[PDB]
Design a protein around this ligand. Structure first.
Ligand SMILES: CN(CCOc1ccc(C[C@@H]2SC(=O)NC2=O)cc1)c1ccccn1
Length: 256
């Protein structure tokens, strides 16, 4: 079955590529100017944000919400390919996605980030970290957590084929609140974890406890969504007509 684990890994990686238009590999190549045809427009202030055309703190923040809505779709398409998943009780299919998508959004957002800022609009634009730190309270600090994490995370130097398995492990969490049949979920994850363990062994031989160090990052991931939600609350207490995209509403409904 170690051959399965390999085939499982290749499978996940193919669907991941099928499901997500902008990979870490492609993102890294835009972030480091492997190109002409590929360099981004840089939004670093209010003007260039205006001229950024391939209230503002509000525009950007809903911009972030439209990205999530797209992300949820892609992640969902990807989940479909995880062997076992569509066989779960669909109440559980639903729960796993609900508690899963943000952890995956932020994992993959890391792929799009460096110390200075984050890629946007399929890597066509690049928004600077200072610029985002410069929105007015409470929007002033909604991204910094993501950045602080992305910096640690990217230190792992994982690539797309590592990430594919990792995000499957995230979804298939038998610890999510309100699962009915947990044992099938953990049977799946056990395979995913083994696939992951082997992949890291093979892809980064020279790299002690990367498997463990990567699992520990799941902790940081959850704290990100934990605090993001805290902040949604501040915004909700502090802002008028702060209505959130219908889809993001269902997801945030009883989440923590
Ligand atoms: C700064 N960027 C990159 C996206 O960066 C993101 C930050 C946070 C999220 C999570 C969203 S925000 C929310 O409240 N709920 C969510 O699911 C999603 C993406 C963008 C992206 C598009 C337009 C403007 N700017």
């Amino acid at each position: 079955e170690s051959a399965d684990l390999r085939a499982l890994a290749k499978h996940l990686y193919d669907s991941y590529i099928k499901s997500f238009p902008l990979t870490k590999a492609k993102a890294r190549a835009i972030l480091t100017g492997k190109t002409t045809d590929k360099s981004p427009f840089v939004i670093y202030d209010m003007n260039s944000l205006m001229m950024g055309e391939d209230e503002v703190a509000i525009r950007i923040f809903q911009g972030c919400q439209f990205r999530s809505v797209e992300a949820v779709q892609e992640i969902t398409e990807y989940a479909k390919s995880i062997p076992g998943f569509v066989n779960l009780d669909l109440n559980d299919q639903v729960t796993l996605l609900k508690y899963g998508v943000h952890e995956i959004i932020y994992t993959m957002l890391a792929s799009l980030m460096n110390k200075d800022g984050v890629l946007i609009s399929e890597g066509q634009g690049f928004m600077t970290r200072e610029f985002l730190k410069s929105l007015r309270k409470p929007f002033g600090d909604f991204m910094e957590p993501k950045f602080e994490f992305a910096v640690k995370f990217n230190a792992l130097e994982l690539d797309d084929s590592d990430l594919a398995i990792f995000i499957a492990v995230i979804i298939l969490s038998g610890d999510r609140p309100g699962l009915l049949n947990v044992k099938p979920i953990e049977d799946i994850q056990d395979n995913l974890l083994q696939a992951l363990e082997l992949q890291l062994k093979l892809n980064h031989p020279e790299s002690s406890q990367l498997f463990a160090k990567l699992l520990q990052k799941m902790t940081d991931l959850r704290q990100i969504v934990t605090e993001h939600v805290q902040l949604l609350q501040v915004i909700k207490k502090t802002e008028t007509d702060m209505s959130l995209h219908p889809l993001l509403q269902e997801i945030y409904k009883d989440l923590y």
